[PDB]
Design a protein around this ligand. Structure first.
Ligand code: ATP
Ligand code: ATP
Ligand code: MG
Ligand code: MG
Lengths: 485, 437, 106
DNA sequence: TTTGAAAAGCAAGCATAAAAGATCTAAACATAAAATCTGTA
């Protein structure tokens, strides 16, 4: 049989097709799923990334500081914690199904608070004030396909591996028809909810409609970017089912960020270390060296980050970058390689904060060649005369030619005109483009300085500035030649 | 350790190929481009260079045959491993299927799996892949060549087999799209008239001498035979270089078309003097010679041209020939003659009823005879046939509804065909355009 | 020196060391002995030949390869496009301009 | 034989239909590995 095409790279999962609704004779024949071995969850890759170390690696004084400020390793989230814990505890205790909506900007401690609520609920269930529950965590951005959530949650409930439609009907039958005394409470965290939004909103409606079912015993904690995500991207059914009591995670104030950073650096700030002067390795309790990071530097970093975002990740990274800058200067001045008072100062914090604020666009255009600068200058002249914000490339060609032939008494132009139009050579004819014309055009397109229209006619194709005009002029005002003309 | 061949007008290009292509992967670029327009000797120079150096391992691929990017990847995967089997037959290998490659990373994985099984070799060698005509791919986009520039970076550095790419390009703008990559490029400028004359002589005199026609016109009626062949090639170039430009292929085709008719006028008097033979066969050097409906349909096409190249306001002046009972004034016609020459522009759009009105105005002709022409079913059948023949076009080309009033009509044929059509039925269509320009 | 002049030309036009390397490599490779290499690096004439070849398929070099009839048709089409407002033309108007030009020449 | 006067032609300007096409999607057509259903055995 001769095949019209071949699919020779098919990788099919071993997932079954029969849903949960057809594996028992009736509703009254379903056994107690709590007393089942595969149901409700009743790591093999960790050995593969281990090797033998044959060098004693030198950890300086700032190494413990930089390891301390990592996001992987709650003074300011106590009302959000109380609200989420009260709602989840009341839904677990009363065998109720509910939705808890949480939204906020990045890094304001939403996932951390939800996980701490879940850990405290598990601690409460361990000592038997609430019935036992299953915890499922589904991130919408960690799914290859959005329907994989259907494959994930059911696999966490029954231990079976099914396809997504069969998993969806299995979850529907489990939430609607299975009695509450026969099942267990399930708390599901939906993280990055905007990634679970499809064109038809099947998954959103299903997940928030299962919470309206009597027998479901399902608690859905939905974590999102904004308050008005259902009112913008979801229908009125899903917006009605999510509810009206929505939990805001506002950005941190500077006191809260300062308290977070001080609670990180609680045991190592204003402390003493044993440091070997020949190598630089530091041991917490040969010179006794006193480590401090100043509270004024942390304070103003907290004030700047809190004014910008309120992001705890940004504040921790600014402090870690300041520690990295101080450690780089320390290892430079002490001659320390890789195998009395050390202070992370305020100037390091201000160097860390300004490094993402300095703009390399003007610095990049300042160090370009003369022909790229001449291109930019001629484009600025065309934008000055005809005022279009989009100039044809042939107009730029004729404006470059005009600027060369008018300032023909300028000494630099007299020295460089043969370079632009003959590459400094006899036996090379007078060219219609300058030397490195498409080179600087593609260079400015690669940098994102310009936008070029997709046309095959080189003259009437238009080119637009992608950056602001005053920084381009500023960069043109630094040069000694283009200032004169 | 490279032999440099001798190409007659490509010395710089051959020296550049000797500079860039070598058996050492340590001093060979990953990518090399040969850019030039058609008939500039790119393929010829590359074949002579690789024939002069048989130690170089080259794989020749033609992307014009492969058409799309997926058969190009599959062809690379097939031909690389076929060349590696025919190069080192004592190496145990696993035959990977070239149809396993549907994506570029699959090509990277397949090439890695092929190349790791040749690590028993002693010296690092180059495998040259010539993509002769990369921008002749019929499914070409701007992002495809970027995937081939960076392909060596995803392959292992310490391999014994080190793949090197040699690209051939036609268009200058396609090459200038990738100028910031700084790929070494050798350019092949177009030949001038003396160069193409010399190339044509030394590439075609050997088979013009040994043609059976030239050896049958002598017997039935070798330096002098070469003189006749070279004089014919020079006469063809002198007559038709203005027509062909500097195209080798067009002059080759003209030599092929005009050689037997030139042989058929060579007598025993014309063989020893070239001027009398040129006067005898003069007609081959003045012209290139490179070439190969019902009455209702013809008048419908003529009426379509009238509807497409006249204005509807002037129709009441040209075709109206009826006696008036109710008092009324006929149209005066256009006031001044414009100079636009409307037959040089694209045709305008007209409706069905204007077409049928002008058609019965121009169609050839007691109380029951009905002199004029009715728009019965065969006129509409002929019009539908004209639309089937693509002699009448619409604004829509697919999912056309013929019955919509928003569908308009235009003629699809030029003037040089309606002149023959109108003179085939003796209609004076040139009078209708004499009132303008 | 000529080498400093070519470095200065690259600095003003390309400011790219791979661009200079792509010309320096066949200067080194095409030399046959030590004295030829020394003369090549003292003169840098191969750099001029390389720069001429890099522009051989541009608009100027493509215009210089045209025949008389091709140049005449191109000038006629450019005349029709300059007279037109959209810069558009076809074969008929360009042939009319060519035919008028040939009658005014003859 | 004139004669004025209404039908008709030309031109500029602006609102607007319409062509051309860029972008995208649904559906027909096509393959294919794992699960599931018959069907004897
Ligand atoms: N209240 C807090 N106390 C201490 N550290 C905190 C606090 N809030 C946030 N952090 C730190 O910031 C990191 C990021 O927080 P988290 O992952 O909870 O953010 P998020 O609000 O869910 O943001 P995103 O929308 O990007 O997912 C945490 O891993 C932790 O290191
Ligand atoms: N320098 C030359 N010396 C001798 N013959 C030549 C020369 N250049 C070209 N020819 C002849 O003309 C033919 C056309 O050359 P070739 O196929 O190399 O052109 P090309 O530039 O690769 O064309 P294309 O882009 O159309 O593939 C050659 O096959 C050969 O017969
Ligand atoms: Mg989070
Ligand atoms: Mg070729």
């Amino acid at each position: 049989v001769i095949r019209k095409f071949t699919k020779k790279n098919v990788a099919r999962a071993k997932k079954k097709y029969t849903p949960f609704s057809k594996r028992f004779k009736s509703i009254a024949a379903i056994p107690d799923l709590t007393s089942l071995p595969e149901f409700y969850g009743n790591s093999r890759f960790e050995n593969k990334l281990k090797t033998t170390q044959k060098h004693q690696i030198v950890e300086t004084i700032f190494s413990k500081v930089k390891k301390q400020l990592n996001s992987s390793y709650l003074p300011a989230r106590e009302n959000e914690f109380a609200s989420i814990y009260l709602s989840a505890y009341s839904a677990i205790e009363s065998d109720s199904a509910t939705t808890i909506y949480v939204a906020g900007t990045p890094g304001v401690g939403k996932t951390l608070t939800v996980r701490e609520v879940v850990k405290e609920l598990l601690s409460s269930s361990a000592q038997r004030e609430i019935p036992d529950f299953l915890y499922v965590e589904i991130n919408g951005l960690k799914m290859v396909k959005p329907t994989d959530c259907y494959e994930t949650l059911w696999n966490k409930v029954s231990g079976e591996r099914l396809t997504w439609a069969a998993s969806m009907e299995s979850l529907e039958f489990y939430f609607k028809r299975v009695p509450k005394n026969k099942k267990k409470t399930i708390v599901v965290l939906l993280d990055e909810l905007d990634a679970m939004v499809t064109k038809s909103q099947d998954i959103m409606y299903n997940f928030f409609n299962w919470t309206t079912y009597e027998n479901a015993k399902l608690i859905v904690i939905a974590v999102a970017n904004t308050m008005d995500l259902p009112e913008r991207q979801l229908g009125n059914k899903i917006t009605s089912r999510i509810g009206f009591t929505r939990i805001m995670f506002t950005g941190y104030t500077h006191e809260e960020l300062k308290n977070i950073i001080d609670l990180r650096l609680k045991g190592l700030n204003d402390s003493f270390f044993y440091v070997d002067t020949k190598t630089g390795n530091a041991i917490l309790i040969v010179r006794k060296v006193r480590l401090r990071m100043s509270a004024d530097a942390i304070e103003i970093a907290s004030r700047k980050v809190a004014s910008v975002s309120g992001d705890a990740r940004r504040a921790l990274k600014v402090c870690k970058r300041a520690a990295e800058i101080a450690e780089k200067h320390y290892m430079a001045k002490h001659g320390y390689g890789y195998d009395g008072v050390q202070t992370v100062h305020i100037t390091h914090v201000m160097k860390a904060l300004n490094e993402t604020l300095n703009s390399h666009v003007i610095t990049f255009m300042t160090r370009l060649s003369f022909t790229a600068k001449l291109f930019i200058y001629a484009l600025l002249n065309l934008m000055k005369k005809n005022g279009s914000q989009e100039q044809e490339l042939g107009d730029i060609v004729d404006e470059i030619k005009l600027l060369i032939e008018v300032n023909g008494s300028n000494k630099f132009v007299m020295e460089i005109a043969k370079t632009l139009f003959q590459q400094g050579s006899d036996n090379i004819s007078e060219q219609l483009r300058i030397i490195s014309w498409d080179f600087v055009l593609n260079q400015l397109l690669d940098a994102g300085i310009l936008f070029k229209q997709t046309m095959k006619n080189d003259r009437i194709c238009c080119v637009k500035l992608n950056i602001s005009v005053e920084e381009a002029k500023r960069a043109m005002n630094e040069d000694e030649t283009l200032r004169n003309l | 350790n490279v032999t440099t061949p001798e190409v007659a007008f490509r010395e710089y290009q051959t020296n550049c190929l000797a500079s860039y292509i070598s058996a050492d992967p340590d001093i060979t670029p990953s990518n090399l481009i040969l850019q030039g327009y058609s008939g500039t000797g790119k393929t010829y120079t590359l074949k002579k260079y690789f024939n002069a150096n048989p130690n170089l391992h080259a794989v020749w691929l033609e992307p014009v045959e492969l058409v799309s990017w997926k058969p190009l990847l599959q062809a690379i995967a097939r031909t690389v491993q076929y060349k590696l089997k025919t190069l080192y037959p004592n190496i145990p290998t696993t035959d990977y299927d070239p149809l396993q490659v549907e994506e570029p990373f699959l090509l990277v994985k397949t090439l890695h799996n092929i190349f790791v099984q040749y690590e028993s070799l002693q010296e690092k060698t180059c495998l040259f892949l010539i993509l002769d005509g990369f921008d002749s791919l019929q499914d070409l986009d701007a992002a495809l060549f970027n995937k081939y520039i960076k392909l060596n970076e995803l392959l292992p550095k310490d391999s014994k087999i080190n793949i090197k790419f040699i690209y051939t390009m036609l268009e200058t703008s396609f090459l200038q799209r990738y100028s910031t990559h700084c790929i070494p490029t050798v350019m092949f400028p177009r030949y001038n008239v003396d160069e193409v004359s010399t190339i044509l002589v030394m590439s075609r005199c050997g088979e013009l001498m040994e043609d059976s026609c030239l050896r049958k016109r002598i017997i039935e009626e070798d330096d002098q035979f070469q003189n006749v062949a070279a004089n014919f090639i020079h006469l063809i170039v002198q007559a038709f270089h203005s027509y062909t430009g500097n195209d080798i292929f067009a002059l080759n085709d003209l030599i092929d078309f005009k050689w037997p008719k030139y042989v058929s006028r060579i007598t025993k008097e014309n063989i020893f003097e070239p001027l009398a033979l040129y006067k005898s066969a003069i007609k081959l050097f003045l012209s290139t010679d490179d070439n190969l409906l019902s009455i209702i349909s013809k008048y419908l096409l003529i009426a379509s041209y009238i509807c497409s190249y006249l204005e509807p306001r002037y129709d009441a002046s040209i075709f109206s020939r009826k006696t008036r009972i109710i008092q009324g004034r006929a149209a005066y016609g256009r006031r001044k003659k414009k100079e636009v020459n409307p037959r040089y522009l694209q045709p305008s759009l007209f409706a069905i009823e204007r077409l049928l009105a002008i058609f019965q105005a121009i169609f050839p002709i007691a109380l029951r005879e009905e002199s004029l022409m009715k728009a019965n079913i065969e006129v509409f059948q002929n019009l539908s046939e004209l639309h089937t023949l693509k002699l009448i076009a619409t604004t829509m080309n697919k999912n056309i509804d013929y019955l919509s009033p928003k569908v308009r009509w235009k003629v699809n044929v030029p003037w040089e065909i309606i002149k023959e059509i109108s003179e085939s039925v003796h209609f004076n269509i040139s009078d209708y355009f004499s009132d303008i320009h | 020196s000529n080498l400093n002049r070519h470095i200065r030309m690259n600095f003003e036009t390309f400011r790219s060391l791979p661009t200079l390397k792509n010309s320096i490599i066949p200067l080194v490779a095409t030399s046959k002995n030590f004295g030829s290499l020394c003369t090549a690096i003292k003169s840098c004439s191969f750099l001029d030949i390389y720069n001429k070849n890099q522009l051989s398929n541009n608009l100027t070099g493509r215009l210089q390869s045209l025949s008389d009839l091709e140049l005449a048709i191109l000038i006629s089409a450019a005349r029709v496009a300059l007279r037109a407002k959209d810069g558009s033309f076809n074969f008929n108007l360009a042939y009319a301009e060519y035919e008028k030009m040939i009658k005014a020449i003859n």
